[PDB]
């Protein structure tokens with residue numbers, strides 16, 4: 001089973017990276033470490049590398065995604081997506 005996390009915007013420093021940020025609890029729940037590939041599915045599905053959360057975001061059930069990943073997952077900011085190992 002995947003986990004669900006709420007889409008939020010990427011920090012500018014991560015825009016144009018095929019990568020998303022999620023905290024360690026979230027990584028632990030799907031069994032991935034920083035640098036591994038995750039599958040992300042809103043209404044569409046895409047893949048991206050796992051980055052750790054910024055400190056301000058630890059413990060939040062969010063996943064930070066830039067515009068390209070949001071487009072490819074078919075998900076808007078504030079909507080949940082399913083995240084699983086790739």
Ligand SMILES: [Zn+2]
Pocket residue numbers: 011013
């Ligand atoms: Zn920064």
Ligand SMILES: [Zn+2]
Pocket residue numbers: 014015016017018019066067068069
């Ligand atoms: Zn990207």
Ligand SMILES: [Zn+2]
Pocket residue numbers: 032033036
């Ligand atoms: Zn790993």
Ligand SMILES: [Zn+2]
Pocket residue numbers: 034051052
């Ligand atoms: Zn890093």
Ligand SMILES: [Zn+2]
Pocket residue numbers: 074075076079
């Ligand atoms: Zn939507």
Ligand SMILES: [Zn+2]
Pocket residue numbers: 008077078
């Ligand atoms: Zn929000």
Ligand SMILES: [Zn+2]
Pocket residue numbers: 004080
């Ligand atoms: Zn749902």
